[PDB]
C-alpha cells in the first residue's frame, strides 16, 4: 500500500520573488470606491517564496513547516496536483487532515492516519482503452477514529495555457481557512505580475494542532511530469486596500515594507507629491526572550492547607504564612474539586507566570449558604461579625463541600 520511490539526490533550494501576490478578502463585507486598511496575517510583498519543481526525475516533495499559514501556487497544464495533508507528526497517536481530489469529487478527512513517507496517487489508463483509468491511492496504511468527513463538488479543476491556481491556508482557533483563485496564465516558468483577489472557498471546523504539511502528486513505473509549485509563509501585516468602482480589489500596499509605502499608507493615497515627510521612529525588534525567577526548589504546602484534618471555626479563623515554595497548583487536579474559586486583582490564566509577595492563607468552615458572603462589600452575619474582606482585595477565595468530614450522625 506504501511505496517510497524517492531518489537520494537532495536538491539546492531555489527561491523566487512573489512581487504582489496572495491578497484575499479578509471579511465578507462589500465595498466600492474606497481605501480600507486592515491588520491581519498576510503574505508580505516582494518576499522570498520557495520554488519546488517536479522535473527532477531526469537522467521530490518534502514535508514543509506550517509556521502561521502558507501561500501555495501551482502552475501545471493538466491536473498533476492533488490535495495536501496537514498535521503535527504525520503518524498515529495524533489526528491529521487530508484533502484529496479523486475523480468527480473532493473529499476531506480528519482522522488518525498512518501516511506513507512518499504518499502519492497513481493513475494509469488515461490512454489504455481510454476507459476506466483506474487509480491507486498510496497515501496511508491505516485510517481509523475519524471525526470529520466531507465530500463535495471538486476544487478548481474545470476546463496552450498553464493554469495558475492560488491557495492560502491558515489554522486559527480550531478552524481551517482556505482561500483560492484560478487564472489561465500564459507566461511560463513563474507566477505572473498581475493582481487577483482570492475569493474564499472553505472554513472547516477541525480543531487539531498543525505544525507540518505535505503535498500529494498524481503520477502516471511512475512518471511525474514537469509542473511546479510555490510555497510562501504568512506574517502579521497591515495592508492598505482599495477595491474598485464595483467591489473587487484592484490594489493594496504593505506599510511595514519600505519607507515610502509608510507614507502612502499614512496619507491614505496611492500617489505621493514632491516633498519630505515624517515617518515612524526607528524601531528595533527583540531577538530573544528571557525569564529570571529566584532559586526556589520546594513545592508549596498544598497538602497541609487543602488536605488538613481539622479546620478552624469562622469566628477564630486561622491564618498561615507561605514562603519559599513553587506554587504549582496542578497537583490539586487529582485529589481536589472546588465548588467556588474566584480571584480579585489578577487573572486566573496569569497565575502561572507571576510571582507573589506576602502570601497568607486564611482557613475556616462555614455553612453552605454563607459562602456567598466571602467577598468584598457583603453584608450578613459572617461578613459583619466573623470575617470581613477588604474592598481593595487582591487574591483568591476557594471553597468546597466537606459534608463527608465535618458531619456526624
Amino acid at each position, epitope marked *: *500500500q*506504501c*511505496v517510497n520511490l524517492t531518489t537520494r539526490t537532495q536538491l539546492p533550494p531555489a527561491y523566487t520573488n512573489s512581487f504582489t501576490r496572495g491578497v484575499y478578502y479578509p471579511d465578507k463585507v462589500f465595498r466600492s470606491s474606497v481605501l480600507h486598511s486592515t491588520q491581519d496575517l498576510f503574505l508580505p510583498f516582494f518576499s522570498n517564496v520557495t520554488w519546488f519543481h517536479a522535473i527532477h526525475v531526469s537522467g521530490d516533495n518534502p514535508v514543509l513547516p506550517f509556521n502561521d499559514g502558507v501561500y501555495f501556487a501551482s502552475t501545471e497544464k493538466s491536473n498533476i496536483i492533488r490535495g495536501w495533508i496537514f498535521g503535527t507528526t504525520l503518524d*498515529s497517536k495524533t489526528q491529521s487532515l487530508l484533502i*484529496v481530489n*479523486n475523480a468527480t469529487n473532493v*473529499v476531506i*478527512k480528519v*482522522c488518525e492516519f*498512518q501516511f506513507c513517507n512518499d504518499p502519492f496517487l497513481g493513475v494509469y489508463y488515461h490512454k489504455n482503452n481510454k476507459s476506466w483509468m*483506474e*487509480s*491507486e*491511492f*498510496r497515501v496511508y*496504511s*491505516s*485510517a*481509523n477514529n*475519524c471525526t470529520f468527513e466531507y465530500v463535495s463538488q471538486p476544487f478548481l479543476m474545470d476546463l496552450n495555457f498553464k493554469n495558475l491556481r492560488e491557495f492560502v491556508f491558515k489554522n486559527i482557533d480550531g478552524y481551517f481557512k482556505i482561500y483560492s483563485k484560478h487564472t489561465p496564465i500564459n507566461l511560463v516558468r513563474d507566477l505572473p505580475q498581475g493582481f487577483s483577489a482570492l475569493e474564499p472557498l472553505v472554513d472547516l471546523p477541525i480543531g487539531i494542532n498543525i505544525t507540518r504539511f505535505q503535498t500529494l502528486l498524481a503520477l502516471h513505473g511512475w512518471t511525474a511530469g514537469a509542473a511546479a509549485y510555490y510555497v510562501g509563509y504568512l506574517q502579521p501585516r497591515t495592508f492598505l486596500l482599495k477595491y474598485n468602482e464595483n467591489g473587487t480589489i484592484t490594489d493594496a500596499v504593505d506599510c511595514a515594507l519600505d519607507p515610502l509605502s509608510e507614507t502612502k499608507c499614512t496619507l491614505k493615497s496611492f500617489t505621493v507629491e514632491k516633498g519630505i515627510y515624517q515617518t515612524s521612529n526607528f524601531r528595533v525588534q527583540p531577538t530573544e526572550s528571557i525569564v529570571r525567577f529566584p532559586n526556589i526548589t520546594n513545592l508549596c504546602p498544598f497538602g497541609e492547607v487543602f488536605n488538613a484534618t481539622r479546620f478552624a471555626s469562622v469566628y477564630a479563623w486561622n491564618r498561615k504564612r507561605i514562603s519559599n515554595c513553587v506554587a504549582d497548583y496542578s497537583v490539586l487536579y487529582n485529589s481536589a474539586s472546588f465548588s467556588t474559586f474566584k480571584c480579585y486583582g489578577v487573572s486566573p490564566t496569569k497565575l502561572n507566570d507571576l510571582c507573589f509577595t506576602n502570601v497568607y492563607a486564611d482557613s475556616f468552615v462555614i455553612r453552605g449558604d454563607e459562602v456567598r458572603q466571602i467577598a468584598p462589600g457583603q453584608t450578613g452575619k459572617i461578613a459583619d461579625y466573623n470575617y470581613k474582606l477588604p474592598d481593595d482585595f487582591t487574591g483568591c477565595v476557594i471553597a468546597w463541600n466537606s459534608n463527608n468530614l465535618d458531619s456526624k450522625v
Partner: antibody
Framework: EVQLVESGGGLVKPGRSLRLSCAASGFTFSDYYMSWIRQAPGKGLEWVSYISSSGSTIYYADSVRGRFTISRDNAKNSLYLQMNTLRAEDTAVYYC???????????????????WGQGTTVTVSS | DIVMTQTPFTLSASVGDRVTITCRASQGIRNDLGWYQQKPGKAPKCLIYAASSLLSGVPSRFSGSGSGTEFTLTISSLQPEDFATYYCLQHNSYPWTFGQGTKLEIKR
C-alpha cells in the same frame, strides 16, 4: 462495532454439496476484497478463496479449483461458497475474512486481515 | 505465488525473556507484512500490520523489524498471556499467503 457472521455448515456425506453464507455489518462492503479461509483440525491456516468487488477477479486454491464457487452481493452485504462434490479432506473450520481495502478508494481500518468471523465447522464422513 | 517461511517453529521459553521469530519471503515485498496470533480454539487477530506498526490495543512489548525480505517479530519480557501460535502473512500481492505458525511453549 464491525462484524462478520457465518452460517451453513454441519455434516455432509461425500459426493454431495453445501452452501456457506457470510453476512457483514458496519463496513462499506463494496470497498473490500473478501476471503474464505479454512483450518483443518490439528493443522495451520490456509486460504481457500479471494474475491474482489463486483466479482471480476477471483482466486481459488489449487486444491479446490473447479469444485467451489464464490459469490458476492454488495446490496445484501453477503458472501458465499457453493461447495460441490465434497471430499473427506474438507473437514475443517471455515472463516469469513475481510482484508481488502481496495486501492482505488478512501477506505478505513488497517491494511491487512484485521476483522474475522467466528468459524463454521464442516464435517465430511459417510 | 509468494511463499513464506517461518524459521523457529515450536520455540520454547521461560516467562519474562526475549523471543525472536524470523519470517522470509520469495519475492520483494516492501513493508506489507502482518503478524497474527492464534490461541487454541479462537480466531486469529492482527498484532502488527505494516511490519513495524502495532495496532490499537496491543501492548508495547511486541516489536517488528522489516526489509524487502527477512522480517522479524520480537517479544521482550514474556507474560503468560503471550503463549500462542504466531503466523506471518504477506499483504503485497493477491492471493495473500500465510506462513506456517510457531507454537511457543513454557519452560519446565
Amino acid at each position: 462495532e464491525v462484524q462478520l457472521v457465518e452460517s451453513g455448515g454441519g455434516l455432509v456425506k461425500p459426493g454431495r454439496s453445501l452452501r456457506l453464507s457470510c453476512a457483514a455489518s458496519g463496513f462499506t462492503f463494496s470497498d473490500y476484497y473478501m476471503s474464505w479461509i479454512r483450518q483443518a483440525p490439528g493443522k495451520g491456516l490456509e486460504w481457500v478463496s479471494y474475491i474482489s468487488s463486483s466479482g471480476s477477479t477471483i482466486y481459488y486454491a489449487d486444491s479446490v479449483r473447479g469444485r467451489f464457487t464464490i459469490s458476492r452481493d454488495n446490496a445484501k452485504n453477503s458472501l458465499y461458497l457453493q461447495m460441490n462434490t465434497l471430499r473427506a479432506e474438507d473437514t475443517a473450520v471455515y472463516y469469513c475474512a475481510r482484508g481488502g481495502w481496495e486501492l482505488r478508494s478512501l477506505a478505513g481500518g488497517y491494511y491487512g486481515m484485521d476483522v474475522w468471523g467466528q468459524g463454521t465447522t464442516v464435517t465430511v464422513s459417510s | 505465488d509468494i511463499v513464506m517461511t517461518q524459521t523457529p517453529f515450536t520455540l520454547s521459553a521461560s516467562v519474562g525473556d526475549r523471543v525472536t521469530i524470523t519470517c522470509r519471503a520469495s519475492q520483494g515485498i516492501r513493508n506489507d507484512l502482518g503478524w497474527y496470533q492464534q490461541k487454541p480454539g479462537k480466531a486469529p487477530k492482527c498484532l502488527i500490520y505494516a511490519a513495524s506498526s502495532l495496532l490499537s490495543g496491543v501492548p508495547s512489548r511486541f516489536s517488528g523489524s522489516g526489509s524487502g525480505t527477512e522480517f522479524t517479530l520480537t517479544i521482550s519480557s514474556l507474560q503468560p498471556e503471550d503463549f500462542a501460535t504466531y503466523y506471518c502473512l504477506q499483504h503485497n500481492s493477491y492471493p495473500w499467503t500465510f506462513g506456517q505458525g510457531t507454537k511457543l511453549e513454557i519452560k519446565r
